């Protein structure tokens, strides 16, 4: 019943190949709903959810102009960070950020986020108080100084407590048929002999949304964390996700093993066994 909105921004310099690419992707939970890309050949293409298209040209024009401003700001920020780290003009560098809000079932703010990474390392983040910063190093301390001087946290707080929460509500209402629907996993257990004395049991979860899921193997009711191979949850391409967990078991001992599945779309948690 809880939900999040998050934008994932990436600015990446490419010396000799133009100005840095900037892309901003917006998500409600695990659903991408907008994408803005500085390299877009036609803004008429920058994909958006059907429930965003219904917002009309005013929404799109406003957001396009914010994106253009953000492109400039993060391009100049890349330039400044290159200086703070005494880096040459020759290499490519990456500035990432994530920002947005988490709300509960009642649509009330649980917490806000606004953080950044440079070349894959945490750089600066707005604290949970939405008033103060945590800077990772002496470079980020300069950004902190500039942002404190310009009262940026106050603007970020206003967005996170106001705009973000208000629009997440609007989006959840307009997109309810998908955004507020949890699709349970379809599950099964497969069995693959490895040798005459061992076999793999693989517990499958397919077709679920959102991506959050718990998939565990037990032996005689004891968690098999160390002995379980657990692949990363992966997108199917139709909004849903997939995952599997596998354990290697001695031949004939299969019935000592149970797969346990928890997911928001399930009426109740599943317990599965290999069914020869």
């Amino acid at each position: 019943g809880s939900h999040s909105m998050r934008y994932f921004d990436t600015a990446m310099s490419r010396p000799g190949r133009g100005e840095p690419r900037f892309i901003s992707v917006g998500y409600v939970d695990d659903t991408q709903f907008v994408r803005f890309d500085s390299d877009a050949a036609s803004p008429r293409e920058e994909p958006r959810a059907p429930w965003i298209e219904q917002e009309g040209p005013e929404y799109w024009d406003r957001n396009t102009q914010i994106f253009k401003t953000n492109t400039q700001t993060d391009r100049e920020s890349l330039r400044n960070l290159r200086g703070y780290y005494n880096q040459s003009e020759a290499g490519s560098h990456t500035l990432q950020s994530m920002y947005g809000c988490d709300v509960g079932p009642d649509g009330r703010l649980l917490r806000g986020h606004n953080q950044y990474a440079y070349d894959g390392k945490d750089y600066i983040a707005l604290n949970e108080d939405l008033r103060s910063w945590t800077a990772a190093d002496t470079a980020a301390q300069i950004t902190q100084r500039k942002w404190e001087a310009a009262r940026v946290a106050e603007q970020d707080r206003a967005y996170l407590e106001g705009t973000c929460v208000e629009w997440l509500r609007r989006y959840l209402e307009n997109g309810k048929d998908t955004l507020e629907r949890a699709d349970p996993p379809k599950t099964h257990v497969t069995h693959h002999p490895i040798s005459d004395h061992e076999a793999t049991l693989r517990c499958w979860a397919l077709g679920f949304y959102p991506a959050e899921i718990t998939l565990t193997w037990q032996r005689d009711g004891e968690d098999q964390t160390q002995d379980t191979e657990l692949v990363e949850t992966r997108p199917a391409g139709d909004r849903t996700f997939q995952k599997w967990a596998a354990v290697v078991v001695p031949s004939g001992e299969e019935q000592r093993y149970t797969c346990h599945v928890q997911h928001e779309g399930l009426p109740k948690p599943l317990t599965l066994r290999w069914e020869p």
């Binding site: 803005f36 957001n63 914010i66 401003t69 400044n80 960070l81 920002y99 606004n114």
Partner: peptide, 9 residues
């Protein structure tokens, strides 16, 4: 809805 980034880092 996008958040405005106005102040250079």
């Amino acid at each position: 809805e996008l958040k405005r980034k106005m102040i250079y880092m």
